[PDB]
């Protein structure tokens, strides 16, 4: 569960970029391109995205690095 | 005031009524007009032959 979003505000500032980052992450987990990097407790992808923010292993920068890495693997998988 | 019915009444209120003989006089002017256009037809032979 997730009652307050305070820790995610302390990791990612500005309180509005948090929404966009968590939205992009939860779309990566709902549309099945990925799978969660934290144990889920039957939470929806919203709360799983916020918990992945609070563990520090997701922000905008890490998502950009991972997305460019997927694009490089597509370029290597063109054959 | 705008009230364009009243502007119509005031635009036609200047025209006065006719006597019972002035109508016959206007009708005779109408007769003179149709007389002159039929006499104008009367000189033109192509309408005749048409």
């Amino acid at each position: 569960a997730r009652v307050t979003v305070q820790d995610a505000v302390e990791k990612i500032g500005n309180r509005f970029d948090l929404v966009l980052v968590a939205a992009r992450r939860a779309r990566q987990m709902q549309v099945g391109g990925k799978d969660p990097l934290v144990p889920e407790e039957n939470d929806k992808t919203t709360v799983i995205a916020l918990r992945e923010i609070e563990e520090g292993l997701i922000n905008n920068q890490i998502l950009d690095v991972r997305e460019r890495q997927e694009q490089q693997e597509q370029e290597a998988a063109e054959l | 005031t705008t009230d364009p019915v009243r502007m119509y009444m005031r635009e036609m209120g200047t025209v006065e009524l006719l006597t019972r003989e002035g109508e016959i006089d206007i009708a005779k002017r109408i007769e003179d007009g149709i007389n002159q256009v039929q006499c104008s037809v009367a000189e033109y032979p192509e309408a005749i032959t048409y």
Partner: protein, 1334 residues
């Protein structure tokens, strides 16, 4: 998809380009079968097909074709949504004036031709003629005629003469005009000639002209030649159930226009006489003008009905137009509505919600999960499964609810806490359970009010409602830093019963090892809930850097305080629970817990407070009863004494000793005195009535009366209502506003007889009517305030300026009304502030001041702080975050992006429901006098010759405890800097006598004082000193009318006494009633009198609107020596003599009215020349922008703090910013603008900083304050100027200008339905702005 919205005029070629048909016939549909008639107002070949992909005849019924048109009957076989889209046209036979460019108040054909509007309507109604460029023979261009004058001009000039009448004439006038020739002409008339008000009108007209030519418009497009028609599914004629139709009234309007156009074509075929076709052209003018905007004529009503019909501008403009009924606010799917109720078993991140509403709202989610889990093979099976409500769907619904926030909403959504998110817990029931602590945010009582739930569908909206709008985020108001989740009524009663102490109870004075055996003693019944007891508690504190230092001790406390101590988190000290804990104390408790431990312990602490408050209120049994209202034994005795005293005043009035008014005032004063004695009787009979015993005789304490706990805890009501229940209730006022001499000597515990209750009914009904009307006006005030200020968005991180205003405490005449601490807390410093020992930096230059910094301010002796304010920011098109402050639901600085204009205007207009001698020094300290210039008289006192003196009571800590506006010419006992005592009247002026005091000492004389004319000879009966005293204007004769009496001084030698220090004598001019007491050649001393001169909410909506005051304070323009000019015009010439500059300014003052300054003195710019209210225009134009924003915030904070409602000053300052965006430029220079042009301050600022960065000279401006209903329409974005106020003037003003709207500021983006460039959409607009044109 697109960018900026453009608006302009419509050429007839443009209108033929839009339209896909000419509508030649007035039919609508065929009557027998309801196919549409070709080619009527509802057509096929003009607009579209009736059915989806089907011709009208039936030759083409399916998707075999989509491009074809049927050659039997024209149908372009497409979707029928196309019929919602394609438009038509009407070829008007004779041209027709457009009513919007004819009848709006700044009339465009009116001041485009420079012709008065009555003559234009006289031309358009065929009452007269007008020349249309008729050469130069005898008749000018705009020279109108009449019919007889037309026959005159035609028989006098047979040819080279042109003058039509009607719409053809106005169209020929607009077509004939060459614009830039008249542009050169008016530029020459504004260069050489000067006719001030007329040339101001002239420069307005040249502004219109060179705005028109800069656009792509032609003037003759203001006359309609081809009139466009609207698509059919916007004016639908659809079947109701029953064979009867609903038409829109636009069908009537277009039917009338098409009908009269066909009639006029039919008349011009038959060569009708002139009276008939002039009738028909007037009728077609009326039909078109009724179609475009009905109501600016004789209001052409509809058929079979007396009610006036609805035109196009009726559908755009107003409460029911598209701007306010279907664009700014839409009815929304995925919503519900039901009655709300309490359910105290909730944490505040969750609310109850019914199972039936949760099944109806979340239907597509349930459909999706059921077709995912394979219980329903198709989706129709899912429909029937959730229709039959089988037992498998409730587990599915519990899966789809679990972490999905809903939005709860109460209908008067004034401030932004009206919409909050929650997580639903499903309820066996039909009522939304709403958490109790949240309800004070809603202003929701549970007396039957019903709330609405909305559902965030998409994923981003779920994350918005959790991250921004969950209820645990909003525990601070946006109006101030106070908690809005304050415990309201049952919980504070449970606390106030729980933490108290009676002098004898079970377990009196025993010892306890901790809170745990306090709970074991109370819940076993050995010891009482409240008994004073030594316990051992362990409190933690944050002494080191974020470290929980533990200290343990035996505190002397009660049992119930120890039981509540388990609920306090680790960080707080014990002194937060050692007092009685009313409502103020528990609000301070939650505030300290939030400002120390952050958000999470405060949320779970608020939930635990609510639980323990309800539980021990249940254990309290706090119950009201009839014995709980003790009537004083001293009541009827005081009432009998007052009844004897009114008989005394009655006998004194029947004896003729007094008049009526002094009788009335004495009777109301003695009844108020009796009411005050009854109040001080009943309070001492309630609060200390409990007297019990412990190990001795007796002891008194605070009472365990039920109603005293319910008034002392602050749960419900205060001592006014307790007074009206126990003592006598007040003095009622009649409908005059007068107040009755016979008050209601009975409370509600006693009976009221019929007359007393009948008098009370008037006050009750006046109260109800005022609450209704003030609700309406507060709604209107909120709407104007948000619509002046949605454009402002925090956009930059920092501007880095040195500007700022000066925060000082607001003490005035009495004690402190708002201290320095809670004003500056939350703002930021402009420059560094220093200790009273100078060069001691206590804060650096720009740091966010939080509570430890205000602690550092209060431990020192600081009094005034320079603060960055949003009204003096530097940023283009917003306010930089480092200048705004911090105050929000969070405690940190404002984030980059968040809209503060909207939260500011809501936090101002939300408390709009709640709104409605000598120096007697109180406190002790040292005396200070600012702007003082005084002189010692002969009597050892001190008389004051400067009226800007401000009296400050400065204690040993430098701060100001009292201030007194010192009147001119007072009698100071002590001097300056001497330590004064309490009660000591230092200055004792005569408030009924304006002083004519001096600086000189010598023989008073008469100069230009002729007896009988300027002065009369009075011989006094009382004193006996006969004199020559100045008379009025009626009795002074024609010689001494303009000649004024003057007083002047000599010494013993006869030489003129000069002022010691200067060379000017004291020659002073006396008005009427200025009593000459001391005559010619009479000695005085320094400063003796040469003579004596004897005798709510619409305030806020006047301030922000900034209306001109009725009697303005007059103020000097430039600083200089004041002098008089000519006399007796009704006015006088007030002349200013600056020393360095050029003097020749004089201002007309209506000289009947009492002035302030004397002629011998000198004034500063912005100093007052008389008294009374002053316009904000004067304060802005003379003193400065900081002074006018200080004036607005101090006046409106007086209006709010009179009611006792806290609003932080950031909000009022940013509304002041949004007021003064426009500024007229004085010197044009290298810029493009004009000497009188009004352009916004941000646009001229980016122009100058491009020029001032170059070597050229800039453009100097004049800042100009505008009201909120005028600074919101004067905007560079016309949809925000057309969404709320006068619509027709805005659309025509932006249609003649070709104005382009770049969507700029949240009104247009709500209108056009895209993201908002404030909130989460700020990153999107920043990415797009980086992408756009780069």
């Amino acid at each position: 998809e697109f960018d900026a919205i453009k608006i302009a005029l419509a050429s007839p070629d443009m209108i033929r380009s839009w339209s896909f048909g000419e509508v030649k016939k007035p039919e609508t549909i065929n009557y027998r079968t309801f196919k549409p008639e070709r080619d009527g107002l509802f057509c096929a070949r003009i607009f579209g097909p009736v059915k989806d992909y089907e011709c009208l005849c039936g030759k083409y019924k399916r998707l075999k074709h989509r491009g074809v048109i049927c050659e039997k009957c024209g149908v372009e076989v497409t979707q029928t949504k196309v019929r919602r889209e394609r438009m038509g046209h009407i070829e008007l036979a004779s041209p027709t004036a457009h009513i919007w460019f004819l009848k709006s108040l700044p009339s465009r054909i009116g001041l485009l031709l420079d012709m008065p509007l009555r003559d234009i309507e006289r031309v358009l109604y065929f009452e007269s003629y007008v020349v249309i460029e008729g050469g130069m023979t005898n008749l000018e261009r705009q020279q109108i005629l009449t019919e007889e004058q037309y026959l005159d001009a035609l028989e006098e000039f047979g040819d080279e003469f042109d003058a039509k009448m009607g719409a053809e004439a106005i169209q020929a006038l607009l077509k004939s005009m060459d614009l830039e020739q008249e542009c050169e002409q008016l530029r020459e008339e504004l260069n050489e000639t000067n006719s001030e008000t007329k040339r101001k009108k002239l420069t307005k007209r040249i502004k219109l002209l060179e705005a028109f030519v800069q656009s792509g418009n032609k003037p003759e497009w203001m006359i309609l030649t081809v009139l466009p028609v609207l698509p059919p599914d916007l004016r639908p004629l659809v079947p109701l159930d029953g064979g009867r139709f609903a038409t829109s009234d636009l069908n009537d309007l277009y039917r009338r226009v098409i009908n009269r156009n066909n009639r006029l074509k039919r008349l011009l075929d038959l060569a009708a006489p002139d009276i008939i076709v002039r009738n028909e052209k007037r009728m077609l003018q009326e039909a078109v003008d009724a179609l475009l905007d009905n109501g600016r004529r004789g209001r052409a009503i509809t058929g079979s009905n007396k009610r006036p019909l609805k035109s196009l501008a009726d559908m755009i403009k107003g409460k029911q137009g598209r701007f306010r009924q279907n664009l700014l606010g839409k009815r929304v799917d995925y919503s519900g509505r039901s009655v709300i109720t309490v359910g105290p078993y909730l944490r505040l991140h969750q609310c109850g919600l019914p199972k039936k509403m949760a099944l109806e709202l979340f239907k597509p989610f349930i459909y999706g999960k059921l077709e995912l889990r394979g219980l329903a093979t198709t989706i129709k099976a899912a429909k029937k499964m959730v229709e039959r409500e089988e037992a498998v769907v409730w587990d599915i619904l519990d899966e789809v609810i679990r972490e999905h926030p809903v939005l709860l909403n109460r209908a008067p959504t004034l401030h932004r806490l009206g919409i909050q998110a929650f997580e639903p817990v499903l309820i066996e029931g039909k009522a939304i359970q709403l958490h109790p602590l949240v309800c004070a945010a809603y202003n929701a009582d549970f007396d039957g009010d019903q709330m609405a739930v909305h559902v965030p569908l998409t994923l981003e909206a779920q994350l918005e409602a959790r991250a921004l709008m969950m209820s645990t985020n909003n525990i601070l108001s946006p109006a101030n830093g106070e908690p809005i989740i304050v415990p309201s009524q049952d919980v504070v009663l449970g606390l106030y019963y729980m933490t108290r102490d009676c002098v004898n109870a079970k377990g009196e004075g025993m010892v306890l090892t901790g809170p745990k055996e306090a709970e074991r003693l109370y819940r076993s019944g050995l010891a009482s809930l409240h008994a004073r007891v030594k316990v051992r508690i362990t409190e933690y504190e944050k002494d080191a850097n974020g470290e929980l230092v533990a200290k343990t001790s035996l505190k002397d406390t009660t049992v119930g305080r120890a039981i509540l101590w388990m609920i306090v988190p680790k960080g707080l000290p014990y002194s937060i629970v050692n007092q009685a804990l009313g409502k103020k104390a528990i609000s301070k408790m939650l505030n300290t817990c939030y400002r120390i431990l952050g958000l999470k312990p405060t949320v779970i602490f608020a939930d635990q407070i609510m639980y323990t408050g309800f539980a021990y209120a249940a254990r309290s049994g706090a119950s009201v009863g009839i014995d709980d209202m003790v009537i004083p034994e001293k009541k009827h005795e005081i009432i009998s004494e007052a009844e004897a005293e009114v008989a005394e005043i009655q006998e004194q009035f029947q004896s003729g000793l007094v008049t009526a008014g002094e009788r009335y005032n004495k009777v109301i004063d003695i009844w108020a005195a009796a009411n005050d004695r009854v109040s001080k009787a009943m309070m001492d009979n309630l609060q200390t009535e409990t007297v019990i015993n412990r190990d001795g005789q007796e002891e008194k304490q605070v009472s365990f009366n039920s109603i005293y706990m319910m008034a002392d805890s602050g749960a419900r009501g205060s001592a006014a209502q307790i007074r009206q229940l126990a003592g006598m209730r007040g003095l009622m006022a009649k409908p005059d506003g007068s107040i009755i001499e016979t008050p209601i000597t009975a409370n509600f515990r006693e009976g009221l007889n019929v007359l007393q209750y009948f008098i009370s009914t008037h006050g009750a009904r006046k109260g109800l009517a005022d609450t209704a009307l003030k609700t309406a006006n507060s709604g209107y005030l909120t709407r104007r305030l948000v619509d002046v200020a949605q454009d402002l968005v925090v956009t930059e991180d920092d501007c880095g300026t040195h500007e700022g205003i000066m925060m000082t405490p607001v003490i005035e005449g009495g004690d402190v009304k708002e201290p320095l601490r809670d004003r500056v807390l939350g703002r930021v410093t402009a420059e560094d502030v220093l200790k009273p020992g100078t060069a001691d930096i206590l804060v650096p230059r720009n740091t966010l001041l939080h509570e430890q910094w205000c602690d550092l301010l209060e431990e020192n002796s600081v009094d005034a702080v320079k603060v960055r304010s949003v009204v003096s920011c530097d940023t283009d098109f917003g306010v930089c975050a480092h200048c705004y402050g911090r105050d929000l639901a969070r405690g940190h600085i404002i984030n980059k992006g968040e809209a503060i204009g909207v939260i500011a205007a809501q936090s101002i207009g939300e408390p709009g429901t709640q709104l409605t001698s000598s120096i007697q020094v109180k406190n002790k300290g040292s005396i200070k006098l600012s702007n003082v210039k005084s002189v010692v008289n002969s009597s050892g006192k001190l008389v004051i010759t400067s009226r800007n003196t401000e009296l400050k009571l400065i204690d040993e800590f430098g701060r100001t405890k009292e201030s007194y506006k010192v009147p001119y010419g007072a009698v100071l006992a002590k001097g300056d800097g001497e330590q004064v005592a309490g009660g000591e009247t230092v200055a004792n002026w005569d408030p009924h006598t304006m002083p004519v005091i001096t600086e000189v000492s010598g023989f008073v004389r008469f100069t230009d004082m002729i007896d009988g004319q300027t002065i009369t000879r009075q011989t006094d009966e009382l004193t006996g000193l006969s004199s020559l005293v100045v008379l009025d204007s009626a009795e002074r004769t024609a010689g001494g009318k303009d000649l004024r009496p003057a007083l002047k001084i000599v010494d013993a030698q006869g030489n003129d006494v000069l002022i010691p220090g200067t060379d000017m004598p004291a020659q002073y001019f006396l008005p009427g009633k200025a009593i000459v007491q001391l005559e010619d050649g009479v000695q005085i001393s320094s400063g003796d009198t040469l003579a004596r001169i004897p005798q709510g909410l619409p305030r806020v909506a006047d301030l922000f609107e900034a209306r001109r005051p009725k009697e303005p304070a007059i103020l000097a323009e430039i600083s200089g020596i004041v002098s008089f000019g000519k006399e007796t015009k009704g006015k006088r010439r007030l002349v200013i003599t600056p020393v360095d500059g050029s003097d020749p300014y004089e201002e007309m003052i209506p000289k009947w009215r009492q002035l302030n300054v004397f002629e011998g003195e000198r004034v500063e710019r912005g100093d007052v020349i008389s008294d009374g209210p002053e316009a904000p225009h004067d304060i802005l134009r003379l003193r400065g922008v900081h002074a006018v924003t200080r004036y607005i915030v101090n006046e409106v904070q007086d209006v709010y703090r009179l009611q006792g409602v806290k609003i932080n000053d950031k909000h009022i300052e940013v509304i002041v910013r949004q007021m003064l965006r426009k500024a007229t430029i004085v010197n044009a220079g290298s810029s493009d603008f004009l000497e009188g042009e009004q352009v916004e301050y941000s646009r001229v600022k980016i122009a100058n900083r491009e020029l001032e960065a170059n070597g050229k000279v800039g453009a100097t401006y004049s800042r100009d304050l505008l009201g909120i209903t005028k600074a919101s329409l004067a905007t560079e974005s016309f949809i925000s100027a057309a969404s709320f106020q006068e619509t027709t003037r805005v659309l025509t003003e932006a249609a003649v200008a070709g104005k382009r709207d770049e969507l700029r500021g949240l009104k247009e983006n709500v209108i056009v339905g895209r993201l908002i460039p404030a909130g989460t959409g700020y990153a999107y607009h920043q990415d797009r702005m980086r992408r756009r044109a780069a």
